[PDB]
């Protein structure tokens, strides 16, 4: 009933990894195109002239598998907005390389992070890629509900967490998104992969994301509680959020290791399915309207026109 994917940052064998992911009921797999730790030089010798293949072969999967089942990920070392000019220039070249390889493979989507305020050069490189060649590949911007700095543990002695209600400051991750997509001039290829945290923010911070192009909702395994049976579940706060997200018809991505070790990994997905079945069924309106969501039509003119 629900469309689900699996996020991994470790794939030792691409064929084997998919099989495991598919057996657990997932529809697609978010994974790297180059090894996350395989940092590459493009200017300075001798490392720029590094021999051998730069990544895996496209032949390891079928064209159809790449097209439907794989979602690309930008490498974590790639930081286009670095203060160091060398790292900037390298990350630029690397970002293009990875994006170009994504297009080559014909991936349906590709994940890029929004994990800081300034993503201007990131936007500039992505916009350049979008306006080069032809592709229908989507770009999912990984953006958290709550910034990492704002959900860190209060365990630094000489750096306490902000215990002040900052209305605008708690909405900061939306402003990261807003600026990025404004720079990119509202490209229809750029959408949101909204990362859900352990502690949900205030209601206004969530309402912020109403009317935004949310295509994915990333759920870490860490946010799952455990019931009496000893299987993963979510809070009533998160339940209401998933129920809201199911109306938007987003694709749920599971990320992180199995903290519920005693159980299978399908259990997480089975819970989302459980929620999917257990929702208020569509009324006469929602049943009939199903299909016309945000579909623009010209106002009828029965006087001027003959219906």
């Amino acid at each position: 009933r629900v469309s689900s994917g699996r996020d991994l940052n470790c794939v030792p064998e691409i064929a084997d990894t998919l099989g495991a992911v598919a057996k657990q009921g997932f529809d697609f797999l978010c994974m790297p195109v180059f090894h996350p730790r395989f940092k590459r030089e493009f200017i300075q010798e001798p490392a720029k002239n590094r021999p051998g293949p730069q990544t895996r072969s496209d032949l390891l999967l079928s064209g159809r598998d790449w097209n439907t089942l794989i979602v690309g990920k930008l490498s974590p070392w790639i930081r286009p907005d670095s203060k160091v000019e060398k790292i900037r220039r390298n990350s630029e070249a690397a970002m293009l390389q990875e994006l170009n390889f994504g297009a080559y493979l014909g991936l349906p989507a590709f994940l890029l992070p929004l994990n800081q305020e300034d993503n201007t050069n990131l936007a500039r490189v992505l916009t350049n890629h979008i306006h080069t060649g032809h592709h229908s590949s989507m770009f999912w911007m990984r953006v958290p509900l709550v910034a990492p700095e704002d959900l860190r543990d209060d365990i630094i002695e000489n750096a306490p967490t902000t215990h002040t209600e900052e209305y605008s400051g708690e909405e900061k991750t939306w402003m990261w998104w807003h600026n990025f997509r404004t720079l990119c001039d509202y490209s229809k290829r750029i959408a949101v992969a909204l990362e859900i945290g352990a502690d949900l923010p205030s209601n206004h911070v969530i309402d912020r994301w109403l009317g935004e192009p949310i295509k994915a909702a990333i759920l870490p395994t860490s946010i799952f509680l455990t019931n009496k049976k000893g299987f993963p579940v979510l809070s009533k706060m998160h339940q209401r959020l998933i129920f809201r997200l199911l109306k938007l018809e987003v694709q749920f991505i599971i990320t992180g290791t199995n903290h519920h070790s005693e159980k299978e990994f399908c259990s997480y997905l089975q819970y989302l399915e459980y929620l999917s079945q257990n929702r208020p069924p569509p009324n006469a309106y929602e049943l009939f309207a199903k299909g016309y969501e945000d579909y623009l039509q010209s106002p009828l003119q029965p006087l001027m026109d003959n219906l």
Partner: protein, 303 residues
């Protein structure tokens, strides 16, 4: 030699133990299979030939970082999110997996063993730092103190509760698990490597992304020098009474510095990234480096 047929191109780590047996970790960061392996060399000069090894084993995933657990044990920082523990057998020919706990939600990038030897601390790209017990094989504590990927963690040589950590959030945290709030932030460019001073409990050095090597006292005023042109990958002190600091980088060079961070030695031997350095315990003037060019170079340091 009762081991894998071929080791991986990118050599990630190299460590000497008491007697002088060279430990090697390696990852395949390219090609069909992205796995890792562990190797032992009772003959350091034979490296990195697989036909002349004491021990060798193939791991499930890549090896991001390792270090010696005394004599027998080897603790691994895996890409899988697991921190793996392997133990040499009594003959020291095989390497059997002691434990492998998937607790991190992302690549485990750095690991370090604390003073006691029954405990270790790991840092991961999931922005977490975890304290382990190697006996009970469980996580004692879990700390989300940083706001970005944890780059390096380094245990205090002589204090069990104390360790350093650095991250891409531009923070160097000095820890002490005895405190309610254990972390303490020391006051431009992101820190990439940490190294405690072997003879001074309050002194440590850190390398940054811009290539600068810095000298920091805990109490206080800092000294620094522009050693490399690119990011500093690691810092290792010599076993001398008056230690020499070996610095490695992504500029494909090695530099040995004095106490005042003045350049003594220079080596442009590697053609790829220099990943680790380990001083020979037998001969204190010998230093072994490993890199992604698949070289295991042995340097004669003028001392």
């Amino acid at each position: 030699p009762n081991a894998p047929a071929c080791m991986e191109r990118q050599l990630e780590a190299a460590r000497y133990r008491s007697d002088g047996a060279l430990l090697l970790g390696a990852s395949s960061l390219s090609g069909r299979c992205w796995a890792g392996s562990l190797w032992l060399f009772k003959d350091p000069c034979a490296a990195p030939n697989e036909g002349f090894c004491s021990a060798g084993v193939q791991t499930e995933a890549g090896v991001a970082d390792l270090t010696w657990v005394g004599e027998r044990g080897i603790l691994v920082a895996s890409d899988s999110g697991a921190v793996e523990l392997w133990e040499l057998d009594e003959n020291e020919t095989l390497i059997v997996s002691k434990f492998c706990k998937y607790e991190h939600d992302d690549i485990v990038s750095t690991v370090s063993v604390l003073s006691s030897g029954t405990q270790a601390v790991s840092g991961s790209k999931d922005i977490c730092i975890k304290v382990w017990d190697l006996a009970q094989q469980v996580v004692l504590s879990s700390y989300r103190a940083h706001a970005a990927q944890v780059t390096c963690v380094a245990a205090s040589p002589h204090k069990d509760s104390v360790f350093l950590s650095c991250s891409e959030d531009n923070r160097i945290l000095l820890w002490d698990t005895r405190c309610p709030k254990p972390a303490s932030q020391i006051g431009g460019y992101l820190p990439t490597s940490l190294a405690w001073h072997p003879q001074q409990s309050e002194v440590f050095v850190f390398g940054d992304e811009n290539g600068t090597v810095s000298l920091v006292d805990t109490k206080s005023c800092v000294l620094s020098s522009a050693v490399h042109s690119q990011c500093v990958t690691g810092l290792v002190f010599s076993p001398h009474s008056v230690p020499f600091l070996a610095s490695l980088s992504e500029d494909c060079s090695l530099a040995v510095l004095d106490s005042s961070l003045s350049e003594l030695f220079r080596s442009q031997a590697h053609r790829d990234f220099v990943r680790d350095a380990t001083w020979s315990p037998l001969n204190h003037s010998l230093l072994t480096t490993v890199g992604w060019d698949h070289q295991v170079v042995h340097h004669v340091v003028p001392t």
